[PDB]
Amino acid sequence: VSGYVAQEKLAIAERYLVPQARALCGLDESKAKLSSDVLTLLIKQYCRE
């Protein structure tokens, strides 16, 4: 298995990651939107791994 391109992490997190954690905190999608833009900002800046 390889690493992941910077853009690629967006398509991961948009599907398989946010909903999972959304289920860990007990929320429903109706109340906790996260646009794509906040995610691209995150991965671009706050975590380089």
Added chain:
Amino acid sequence: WLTSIPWGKYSNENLDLARAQAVLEEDHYGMEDVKKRILEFIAVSQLR
């Protein structure tokens, strides 16, 4: 040793934030960050 163990004994919690507000300000000056985080913790458990 086995029978003594609670299996479902459920200490009742308080869950109103108000009483948590008070009791946290009663016993620790300052260190407001940890107070705010723990307060959020109770706030989330009260929902789900």
